[PDB]
Amino acid sequence: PKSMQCKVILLDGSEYTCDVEKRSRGQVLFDKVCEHLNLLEKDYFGLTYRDAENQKNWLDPAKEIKKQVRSGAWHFSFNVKFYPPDPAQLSEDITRYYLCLQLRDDIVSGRLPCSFVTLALLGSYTVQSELGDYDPDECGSDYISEFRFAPNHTKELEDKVIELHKSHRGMTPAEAEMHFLENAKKLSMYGVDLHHAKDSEGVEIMLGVCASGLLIYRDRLRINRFAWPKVLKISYKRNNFYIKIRPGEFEQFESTIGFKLPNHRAAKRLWKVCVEHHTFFRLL
C-alpha cells in the first residue's frame, strides 16, 4: 500500500508529520491529528490547505485528500472551523485551550480586530495561563513578552498586559483560558469568516459567515444580518452567489439576494462554508 507524507501546522506553530494511504479521505488524516492533540471535541475543528490560487480551503473529510490538494503539496493547517458561541459549554478544557490558540492567531493576524484594552486583557490571560502568577524578577520596567498579542506591538501595550497580569494572581490555566474566551467571544468579528464580494450594483462588500448567520458589510454605516433560520436556499452559479430568504409574515414571495465573487472557485467556497455553518449551527 503506497503512503503519502502529510505535514500539518499545529496551532502552537509546530509541525506534525504522519503518513496516510495515498487514496485516504480527509477524515483519516484529521483523526490522526486529533489523536496527536488528545482532542475529543473534534466537531469544531478541521484542516485547511492552500489551492493552486493560494486560497485557504477546508479539507473535506468525506473526500480523497489527493482529489482536493490535486497538484499541490500535502501540507495542511489545523484550525477552528466552527467557533463555539458559548465556549463555557464545551465539555473539555483542552478544547478551550485549542480555541484560545486559534483566537491568538486571529488577533495577531488582524482577522479579529480588538480595542487596545481588550488586546491587553486577552494578552494578560494568555500570560497567566502560560507563565502563571506575575513575577517582578522576570518583568522590569523595560519588559517585552516573547508572546505575540497584537498585529502591532507598542511598549504601552506591553505595560498594560503586565498591569492586568498582576491582577490575576492565583488564577489557574483553565480559569485564565475561560476568561480569555468569555472576553474574545464578545468581539464583533469573533468567528466571522470574511469573503470579498460585489453587490448586484458592483459595489465592493464583504460577506461574513458565522454561527448567527450571514453578514453583509457595505461600509462603516449599515450592516445587514440574515440569521440562518431565515435562509432556505444557498446557491452558486458561475461567479455568483445567491441566498433564498424566507418570506416575512404576510409577504407572498421568498426573496433571492445575489453577489459577484472574484471567480467560480470563490463562489463555490463561500457556498460550501455557508451550507456547513447552516447545518452545524441550526441545532442552537
Ligand SMILES: CN1CCN(C(=O)c2ccc(F)c(F)c2)CC1
Ligand atoms: C456532526 N454534527 C453533530 C451534531 N451537531 C452538534 O451537536 C453541535 C455541536 C456544537 C454546536 F455548537 C452546534 F451548533 C451543533 C453538529 C455537528
